[PDB]
Design a protein around this nucleic acid. Structure first.
Ligand code: MN
Ligand code: MN
Ligand code: MN
Ligand code: MN
Ligand code: MN
Ligand code: MN
Lengths: 483, 483
DNA sequence: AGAGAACAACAACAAG
DNA sequence: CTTGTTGTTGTTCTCTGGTTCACGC
DNA sequence: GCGTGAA
DNA sequence: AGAGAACAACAACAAG
DNA sequence: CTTGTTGTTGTTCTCTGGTTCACGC
DNA sequence: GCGTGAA
């Protein structure tokens, strides 16, 4: 219990052997603080206590190749250890998933990422189920579903009908999940609204393109070292990319005109109306709050799609003081919010918002279909749970919640609020927490590809498909089922 | 002494805690076998022997930030520990160096790499002295020499006149070392001969460009996964790059015509004369033997520039059976070997070859200037060594070697041959081993940039200039002065 | 978001 | 009072959102 | 059969 | 070269 | 005789050779 | 002052 501190003469020698490990093997300084590094060092001081200080270390230490098969061993092992805890959440309707496609930068295999999301004990599960390569077959809808089912067979899940899937609107991905529950990713929808609305407001082409050519010049002339914050290029495939460039120019506006004046290249910025650049940054600033919100899988997120849409309608509210080109942008944004974003929502987005206890809003058109939807889903929950055996009814329990009153406090945690209410609401708070675990976007699959890319590197390029599948899952397992 | 082996019940648990470290912290499997990792694990079993198994590990383990200053501490420390062993080799004329310029792919600083090379105990030293950034100043000759002197001041070397420098023919780098000994890198020279000779033989444009467009199609059509060895693009900035592409096509020729026929794109290869592709690969095959030779710093290399030039003259010897376009290539290659490569050699290249004991060759035009050169260099060695005090003369000892007879055996190691001859030849074998430690090219600086790039990565991009300088040197130190 | 890294800028502490 | 060594705070820089399927006229 | 939409 | 990685293909060995 | 676990051999894939100075007419 | 050579 009472852990002993070593002598300072023995502790300075420990920061000397650690520094020499990072230097010789070319590891990052932060390696000395990994959760698995510490847990491993604790084991090796045990071996010194039992066997003494004269142990054959090379014989004790494993080889990298036997490490490579152990994580493939353990991957098979842990997929069975939870092959039961997983199959329960799918049965009980309370499981959702996100899938998407990615291709790696070296070998160029196309990949199918699958994540899983369900509620446990006041906390959310965020599992990487698998990253299976398509083996260079065409990314047709049939092959995708073929590789989707194959990932779920790893845990003895063969149904897939009770799992709510969240994807982008890729024509081939969309068709794969035509036979089950598919929710449109709201980060791609919000991105479509921005892309189209700027296509449709070409009055703003000249200021944006003018800014784009300043970034292009600072990179070609190797001048970003003079900025305390560098200027960012506009990459269309990145969300809110125009805002990132514009802000990088504003937040460095003073030092940019000076550097430009210095190089006699002052004509590249004098025709740029700074005021409109500032107006677009204030407008798109709230879009970044919504984007970072929609990408949350550690807390409920689907319930905020509808109120975020209202906040977009509020930002682009017509204003008598807008200039002509900004007035037109706000006009096109509220349009595409209607025909691009609202057009591709579902009762899952409204019902998730219903279960946000500040429930005063959609009292109008929606509580009809929401009650019709909520009652049906509490019905299948009983149907399933009665097979688990081998006054205050749901339509009442529905309206009993519909009269609760709670204030928007900054500490309010709706997910905690339903655990602390599972008593009075037994069967509805189960439907609610089934709804509140669905991600509002496919960002969990995006992050899986980022993690994948951290493994398939320049020097680790020979790593195999199943070795990445194994490392990603185990790393996700040791996060969701360890401390 | 007799190191104990642990129980198998305690050894399986060690490959389980190692596998979990690699998984959780996302480290490569090969991390379990680093020289510094093993030396570190040996220390941690000692702490378990002394203090027992209940040690506070988090308090014992250092932070990454205190690791970052320790390697900067140790870097200052070890540059003083050898600030003496280094300054001796420079004094005794037996030190050479290679310098070049590089810029990193993220922050884009220009860098000056400096390596050091001298003889010790039958083995060669290959030191990374420093990678100092120019801080975005212009890479003028004055700033380079300014940063060169600054790297040598780190070890209290202020002379630099006794150090033989080996660089490429960059106009600015060349001018920096106008005041000291500069030897032309022979890898850049050989590369100039190839580049020019192919510019001057445009009859071969159509086969090469035809091959280039097959690689371009296999990459665009994502077809390299069908090849057991992939096709390589021609990058002009890589040495023998045309040979690498051509061979990648030949070694996969059968499977390439089949894949092309399959895609109905068979017209991209039918006009390609395979025989001339094969002739160019056989010719350039020996160039790759010379290139990989010239890049050696663990064994003597400057002494092989002259006999490699002969082997190039021999490969491109006129042959009555050559076709017209190959006959012209060999004609232009032997030309540029004369006006590009031989044009930029020095008596260091001839004298280094002289000290290869199979010394029958240059008996003609060169032993005059070589004797004149060797006698002067043995003279400054005595001048220096007499200040170290606070029959069989050199001109005889020169000719005594000039009558030795030795056979080219495959095990022959000339560097070992001069240690085992320092007795009969005391003062000449010192000049010889001073000559035999000079690198034939600047590849040591190239490799320093490769190592640098292994540190300045995508996620380690915030690492500082002096932190890379420190890590590179210490890693080089622990290789040249440890076991 | 939610991952991996590094470090400038301070704040606490010790030795002197 | 100084320096000289450690520890924590908070900013900056990375990456995934991608490159061809499905459909309708 | 070919242009269009969304990645 | 001379660095960093991974793994297919076998070879040795053990358990059964 | 089978499998099932470990260890070694040898191949394949990375990167640096680079992006602007110096000079002469 | 501008094209050329070598990175
Ligand atoms: Mn997609
Ligand atoms: Mn990508
Ligand atoms: Mn160079
Ligand atoms: Mn580069
Ligand atoms: Mn995606
Ligand atoms: Mn170079």
């Amino acid at each position: 219990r009472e852990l002993k501190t070593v002598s300072a003469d023995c502790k300075k020698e420990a920061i000397e052997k650690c520094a020499q490990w990072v230097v010789r093997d070319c590891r990052p300084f932060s390696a000395v603080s990994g959760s698995g590094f510490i847990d491993m060092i604790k084991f090796f001081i045990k071996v010194g206590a039992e066997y003494g200080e004269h142990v054959n270390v090379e014989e004790l230490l494993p080889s990298p190749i036997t490490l490579s098969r152990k994580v493939t061993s353990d991957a098979k092992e842990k997929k069975a250890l939870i092959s039961r805890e997983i199959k329960s959440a799918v049965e009980k309707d309370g499981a959702s998933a996100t899938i998407d496609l990615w291709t790696d930068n070296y070998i160029k295999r196309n990949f199918l990422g699958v994540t899983l999301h369900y509620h446990e004990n006041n906390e959310l599960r965020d599992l990487i189920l698998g990253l299976k390569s398509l083996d260079f077959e065409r990314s047709t809808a049939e092959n995708i579903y073929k590789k989707l089912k194959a990932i779920f067979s790893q845990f003895n899940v063969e149904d897939l009908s009770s799992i709510k899937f969240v994807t982008d609107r890729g024509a081939n991905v969309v068709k794969s999940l035509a036979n089950n529950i598919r929710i449109n990713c709201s980060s791609h929808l919000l991105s479509n609204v921005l892309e189209n609305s700027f296509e449709e407001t070409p009055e703003l082409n000249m200021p944006i393109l003018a800014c784009k050519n300043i970034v292009k010049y600072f990179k070609k002339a190797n001048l970003q070292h003079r900025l305390r914050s560098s200027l960012k290029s506009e990459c269309p495939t990145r969300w809110n990319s125009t805002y990132t460039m514009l802000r990088s120019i504003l937040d460095n506006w003073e030092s940019v005109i000076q550097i430009l004046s210095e190089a006699g290249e002052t004509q590249r910025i004098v025709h740029i109306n700074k005021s409109i650049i500032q107006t677009m940054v204030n407008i798109l600033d709230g879009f970044e709050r919504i984007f970072k919100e929609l990408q949350t899988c550690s807390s409920p997120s689907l319930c905020f799609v509808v109120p975020s849409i209202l906040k977009v309608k509020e930002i682009c509210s017509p204003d008598v003081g807008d200039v002509a080109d900004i007035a037109k942008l706000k006009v096109n944004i509220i349009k595409n919010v209607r025909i691009i974003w609202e057009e591709n929502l579902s009762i899952w987005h409204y019902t998730a918002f219903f279960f946000y206890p500040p429930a005063l809003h959609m009292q109008q058109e929606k509580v009809a279909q929401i009650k019709e939807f909520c009652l049906s889903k509490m019905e299948d929950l009983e149907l399933i749970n009665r097979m688990s055996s081998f006054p205050v009814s749901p339509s009442d329990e529905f309206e009993f919640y519909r009269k609760e009153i709670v204030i928007l406090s900054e500490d309010f945690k709706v997910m905690e609020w339903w655990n602390l209410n599972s008593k009075k609401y037994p069967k509805l708070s189960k439907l609610a927490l089934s709804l509140l675990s669905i991600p509002a976007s496919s960002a969990a699959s995006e992050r899986t590809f980022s993690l994948a890319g951290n493994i398939i590197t320049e020097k680790r390029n020979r790593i195999g498909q199943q070795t990445v599948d194994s490392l990603l899952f185990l790393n996700s397992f040791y996060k969701n089922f360890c401390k």
